[PDB]
Amino acid sequence: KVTRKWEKLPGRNTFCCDGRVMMARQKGIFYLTLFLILGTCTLFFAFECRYLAVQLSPAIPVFAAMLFLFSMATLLRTSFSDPGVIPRALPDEAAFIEMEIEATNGAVPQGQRPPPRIKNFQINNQIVKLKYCYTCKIFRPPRASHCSICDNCVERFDHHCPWVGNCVGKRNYRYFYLFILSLSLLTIYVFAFNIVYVALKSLKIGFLETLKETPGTVLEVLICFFTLWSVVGLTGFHTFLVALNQTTNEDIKGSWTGKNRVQNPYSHGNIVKNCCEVLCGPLPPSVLDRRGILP
Amino acid sequence: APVSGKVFIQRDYSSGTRCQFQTKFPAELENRIDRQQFEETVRTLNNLYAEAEKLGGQSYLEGCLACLTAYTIFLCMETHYEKVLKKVSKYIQEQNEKIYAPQGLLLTDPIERGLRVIEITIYE
Ligand SMILES: CCCCCCCCCCCC(=O)OC[C@H](COP(=O)([O-])O)OC(=O)CCCCCCCCCCC
Ligand SMILES: *C(=O)CCCCCCCCCCCCCCC
Numbered sequence: 121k122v123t124r125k126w127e128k129l130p131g132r133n134t135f136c137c138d139g140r141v142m143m144a145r146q147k148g149i150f151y152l153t154l155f156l157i158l159g160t161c162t163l164f165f166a167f168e169c170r171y172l173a174v175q176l177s178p179a180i181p182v183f184a185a186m187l188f189l190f191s192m193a194t195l196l197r198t199s200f201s202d203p204g205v206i207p208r209a210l211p212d213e214a215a216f217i218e219m220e221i222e223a224t225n226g227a228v229p230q231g232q233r234p235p236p237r238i239k240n241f242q243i244n245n246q247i248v249k250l251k252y253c254y255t256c257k258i259f260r261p262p263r264a265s266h267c268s269i270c271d272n273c274v275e276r277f278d279h280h281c282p283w284v285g286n287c288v289g290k291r292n293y294r295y296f297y298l299f300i301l302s303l304s305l306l307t308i309y310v311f312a313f314n315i316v317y318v319a320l321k322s323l324k325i326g327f328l329e330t331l332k333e334t335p336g337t338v339l340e341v342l343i344c345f346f347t348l349w350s351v352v353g354l355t356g357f358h359t360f361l362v363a364l365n366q367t368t369n370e371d372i373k374g375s376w377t378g379k380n381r382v383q384n385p386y387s388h389g390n391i392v393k394n395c396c397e398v399l400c401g402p403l404p405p406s407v408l409d410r411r412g413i414l415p
Numbered sequence: 416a417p418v419s420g421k422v423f424i425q426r427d428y429s430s431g432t433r434c435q436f437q438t439k440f441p442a443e444l445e446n447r448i449d450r451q452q453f454e455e456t457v458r459t460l461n462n463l464y465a466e467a468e469k470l471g472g473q474s475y476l477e478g479c480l481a482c483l484t485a486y487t488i489f490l491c492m493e494t495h496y497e498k499v500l501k502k503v504s505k506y507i508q509e510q511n512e513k514i515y516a517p518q519g520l521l522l523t524d525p526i527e528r529g530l531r532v533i534e535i536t537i538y539e
């Protein structure tokens with residue numbers, strides 16, 4: 121048997137379908153999200169699209185299926201994919217880095233913890249300070265951070281969203297944003313058309329008999345109402361962080377949105393170029409090969 | 416081959432958050448290889464990685480063409496960044512086998528070290 125590079129790859133991730141996947145360990149809520157989406161869409165496609173196709177235009181279920189396939193493809197690409205994990209430092213390179221660090225630190229006062237290892241760079245006429253990571257034994261590249269759950273430095277870290285079952289970094293943030301947007305669209309769609317179905321069928325049979333026919337309608341109404349009340353606010357929050365070119369991890373810190381309001385050096389001073397660079401720009405491949413062959 | 420010491424060409428974030436390597440000349444590399452070919456190699460790698468992360472028309476067109484297929488086309492087609500990392504790897508290995516191995520030095524591909532540094536290994 122061959123020894124792939126994922127069974128030895130440190131961290132708290134899980135690898136299924138032979139290694140071509142990468143998810144967190146606490147993927148409990150991922151199954152719940154999958155079951156909710158699939159169950160609500162199947163209830164729709166089996167109890168309301170049939171009627172709204174026989175007795176209305178036949179484009180309703182086809183467009184709903186297009187939105188649902190888009191949402192499913194983007195959710196699976198957000199969860200399964202590699203969020204841009206940085207490989208840990210090899211022993212010699214880490215030793216060399218720490219040697220430079222101690223040589224530059226000089227004599228430390230006794231009884232006092234040494235000052236935090238901080239490197240300062242000049243990005244776009246701005247002072248940017250990296251921070252040492254005592255686990256990965258590297259200097260966090262700009263915009264990177266450390267997910268305390270997964271325990272691996274994600275590049276352009278955003279947050280560890282469990283509802284998708286995986287971190288959200290650089291390689292899978294466009295897919296996460298598009299999944300959120302398409303799920304908000306699909307929720308508004310299913311909700312509006314379930315209301316249309318109830319109105320159009322109660323005008324013919326009545327309310328009590330319509331309800332006694334299928335309770336799937338009120339089930340979907342409740343599910344879509346709450347899913348909207350959450351996901352719409354979420355997508356409104358993200359459409360303003362994919363435009364100013366910021367990350368949730370930075371907004372939480374209140375760095376650029378606070379007392380200073382100094383320019384974030386990673387931006388472009390626009391909204392169109394920012395949206396294009398974050399959504400439709402080019403992305404690096406997986407920097408840690410998992411299907412690689414170890415000796 | 417035995418090792419005598421390792422130097423690393425740290426990344427450069429001066430122009431932006433895009434892959435670009437510093438052009439400083441190492442002190443240990445002195446008397447082992449003339450600075451001209453080293454500067455050239457670093458400049459060629461910089462230009463290649465610039466062609467990788469270059470925004471504009473081609474990148475946005477390819478992005479929209481992929482979004483038109485729910486990002487299911489990346490299961491069969493190799494993206495642009497990989498289509499230039501292949502050239503980067505080929506150029507690095509050919510430049511190594513040409514000029515670096517005779518002097519007793521080794522140039523590694525930055526896609527191994529996580530696109531962070533260049534591990535130049537000095538032999539004796
Ligand atoms: C309602 C259902 C709609 C289905 C639409 C079809 C596509 C759905 C998503 C398929 C999975 C997918 O795209 O995952 C991509 C990532 C890539 O990971 P990495 O290579 O970027 O590290 O992970 C993988 O490469 C996944 C590997 C396993 C899946 C292989 C592709 C399966 C496609 C569908 C086959 C029926
Ligand atoms: C590895 O750990 C895999 C476990 C995580 C969930 C596995 C199932 C993913 C969803 C696949 C089914 C969606 C396709 C729907 C077909 C219409």
Ligand SMILES: *C(=O)CCCCCCCCCCCCCCC
Nearest residue numbers: 136137138139140141192196200
């Ligand atoms: C690890 O568990 C990898 C799982 C990948 C799951 C992909 C989901 C299957 C999609 C089916 C494609 C369409 C056929 C179904 C009827 C339209």
Ligand SMILES: *C(=O)CCCCCCCCCCCCCCC
Nearest residue numbers: 186187190302399400478479482
């Ligand atoms: C860059 O390559 C892509 C730019 C972002 C695309 C925005 C997508 C808007 C909503 C997508 C949902 C489409 C559902 C299909 C029916 C309307």
Ligand SMILES: [Zn+2]
Nearest residue numbers: 253255256273
């Ligand atoms: Zn780390």
Ligand SMILES: [Zn+2]
Nearest residue numbers: 267270280287
């Ligand atoms: Zn994590």
